Write a protein that binds this ligand. Sequence first.
Ligand SMILES: NC(=O)c1ccc[n+]([C@@H]2O[C@H](COP(=O)([O-])OP(=O)(O)OC[C@H]3O[C@@H](n4cnc5c(N)ncnc54)[C@H](OP(=O)(O)O)[C@@H]3O)[C@@H](O)[C@H]2O)c1
Ligand SMILES: NC(=O)c1ccc[n+]([C@@H]2O[C@H](COP(=O)([O-])OP(=O)(O)OC[C@H]3O[C@@H](n4cnc5c(N)ncnc54)[C@H](OP(=O)(O)O)[C@@H]3O)[C@@H](O)[C@H]2O)c1
Ligand SMILES: N[C@H](CC(=O)C(F)(F)P(=O)(O)O)C(=O)O
Ligand SMILES: N[C@H](CC(=O)C(F)(F)P(=O)(O)O)C(=O)O
Ligand code: NA
Lengths: 358, 357
Amino acid sequence: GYTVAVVGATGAVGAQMIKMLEESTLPIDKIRYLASARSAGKSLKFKDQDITIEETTETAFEGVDIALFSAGSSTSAKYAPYAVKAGVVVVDNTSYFRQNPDVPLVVPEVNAHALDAHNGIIACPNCSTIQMMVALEPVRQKWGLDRIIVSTYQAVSGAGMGAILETQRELREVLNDGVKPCDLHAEILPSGGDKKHYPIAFNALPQIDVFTDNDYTYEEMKMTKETKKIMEDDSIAVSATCVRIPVLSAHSESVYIETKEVAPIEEVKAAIAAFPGAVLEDDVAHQIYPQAINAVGSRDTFVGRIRKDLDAEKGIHMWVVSDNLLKGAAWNSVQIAETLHERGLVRPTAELKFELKL
Amino acid sequence: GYTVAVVGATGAVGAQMIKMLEESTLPIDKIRYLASARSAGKSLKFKDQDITIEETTETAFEGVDIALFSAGSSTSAKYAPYAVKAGVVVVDNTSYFRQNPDVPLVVPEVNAHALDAHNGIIACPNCSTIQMMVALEPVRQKWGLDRIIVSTYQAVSGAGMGAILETQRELREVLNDGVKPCDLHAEILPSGGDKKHYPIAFNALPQIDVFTDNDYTYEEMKMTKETKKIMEDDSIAVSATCVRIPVLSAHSESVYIETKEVAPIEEVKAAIAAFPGAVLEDDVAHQIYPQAINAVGSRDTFVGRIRKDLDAEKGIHMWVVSDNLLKGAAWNSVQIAETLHERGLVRPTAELKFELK
Ligand SMILES: NC(=O)c1ccc[n+]([C@@H]2O[C@H](COP(=O)([O-])OP(=O)(O)OC[C@H]3O[C@@H](n4cnc5c(N)ncnc54)[C@H](OP(=O)(O)O)[C@@H]3O)[C@@H](O)[C@H]2O)c1
Ligand SMILES: NC(=O)c1ccc[n+]([C@@H]2O[C@H](COP(=O)([O-])OP(=O)(O)OC[C@H]3O[C@@H](n4cnc5c(N)ncnc54)[C@H](OP(=O)(O)O)[C@@H]3O)[C@@H](O)[C@H]2O)c1
Ligand SMILES: N[C@H](CC(=O)C(F)(F)P(=O)(O)O)C(=O)O
Ligand SMILES: N[C@H](CC(=O)C(F)(F)P(=O)(O)O)C(=O)O
Ligand code: NA
């Protein structure tokens, strides 16, 4: 069996990585929980076992077969290359390595083939991108994809445990203490590292991550760039608006596409229904559509409100929902590791292709 | 001055209509509040004065100059034609008369001209449509509009006072009682008149109003058909997705447009800033963009996140936010009434064109 390390075991994704590992088929002989100096020394469960949390260091990866990283881009940049050098296969939840040509960017239902040529690091894509890829890939396979316009409705757990706690505090202050939403104090949202912070309670913040040079945010551009890499087609036009709403878990997305060929809606429905990891929830006669609260806890991606555009021949609208901590993060990572095992790809990489930052 | 009646004075919109009238320049000699039998007798304030709520009947409109309706489509269906008969000018905040060719469907900043030929009824458009029209008209004036794609983030107050209280209860039960959002009991949302009801707490419900036979909701279809009427151009392609989110007040909209001619972004920002009723809130270097919680209480429509599409040369994305009970309803209605007064259009209609029921 494998020695498996979870880096960032204490965070929101880390907690779900633990759960998905507990429920995994992976033969695990030994598990290790790694975090920062803040959590080192504390204890955390794996099933019934007590696991002591260790500080993540350059030397902490000896004897490790598989390491799942979810501790921010900084941690992966510093330590993932040292893990590869130790002989680990890293599944990385951060954006740091995603656009590196030596790094597969994988949703297993879409591009498992990319895993075969890995060089020690597999990047888990952006959470909002992942669920959109599951929904759209069965459509692309049959009718092609020319463009995507997406507006997201994103849960706060994607910004981490602190953002979850901030959201609950703000809501409790409003609903129990009578504080006005605009009088709330915020410390993290919309973006922890950015200069200014705004309340999320009873609000909708059209900012996820920091702004880039082109007035789109990094989140919006990640949706653009990662889609093109995952689907291996730079010609797919993608533009996004990414918005944080008062939901703790599960991202929802209003997705518009134009296919290359006319895609009859009933066949699109059937195509999505038949695609692994995708579930059709589309019965408007009984008000059946994907809902964030129903998707929580499920590894599946739910698709409904499917209908053609009122004017554009090749245009289709839909509503896509998935648990952002599961398919958006921890489940996608564990599924990658299971696929690596299936394909006999869990082994050291001889040639190091990644800078050691010390 | 005028005698002004508010029909549906006790509701969420009714309360804001009172507030907008209290803050209005309209010369009001006498104020009347109308509602159902359940409210008849009770008292509501107009500034410092005590006004007794009257039951709305087909004969209760004698002497009235202006009637603002926001009491449901069936209430306007039954009573507005009798108000017109009595010589009233009706400003209707329901969807009922909106597609009638004899009825102007008005956003004052956009199509005030349409008021001149009114036949006693002027329809206030759908809330989510209004703020989109305020944002987009200044762009259409200069570079035209080929298509609109819009995804909404709608506040629960649009569904009425009960939807607010249902949302608050649900959130309290999750946060205070540890009830999973899954297990919440709902009675109103997504749509009061529909068969099944779902929790909104920590959720996003892709249903507003009921479904039509083309799989779009009436809300999505209203944004389509009302846009075409307001902008007087049936050639504008409009497709919408309308979503309820856990916000009490103010609608947000992710709006994609394609113009007829390429519209330079700084000029688009300048045109929106210069347009009455629209405010530019767009300074990404300082994280400035419209926000629902900031828009509550204001008559203005706030526009930001303005940027060209990454690929379509004439494509532009933006973010539009307005208080759905103000510009979305009560303020648009009162502003209509003020515009009628300015244009000398508050007078009895000679020819009745609406069937008495
Ligand atoms: N409510 C509770 O009683 C409870 C439950 C769960 C989590 N928590 C705590 O709340 C914190 C919230 O985290 P967050 O909002 O900042 O984001 P987060 O995404 O939820 O977690 C970030 C993860 O990255 C790890 N990390 C950060 N810097 C690191 C470094 N230099 N080297 C190795 N790992 C590093 C963190 O470990 P560290 O934990 O050591 O910082 C954490 O596991 C967690 O870190 C956790 O300690 C509390
Ligand atoms: N706790 C709650 O669930 C909640 C809270 C406040 C009010 N309500 C009542 O529930 C009903 C619908 O719920 P909602 O929250 O969506 O209300 P709403 O939209 O905020 O208000 C609807 C308004 O229309 C009026 N109206 C209804 N039927 C009428 C009729 N046949 N003739 C004249 N006026 C009429 C109501 O007056 P009336 O008040 O006289 O009915 C009310 O002022 C309303 O009638 C409202 O009064 C419910
Ligand atoms: N902030 C996250 C998305 C991110 O920006 C991220 F976590 F860095 P990713 O690795 O791209 O999923 C969110 O709102 O869900
Ligand atoms: N349900 C309302 C919109 C409506 O359906 C309406 F109140 F009937 P309208 O008069 O068309 O604004 C909302 O979501 O805000
Ligand atoms: Na194998």
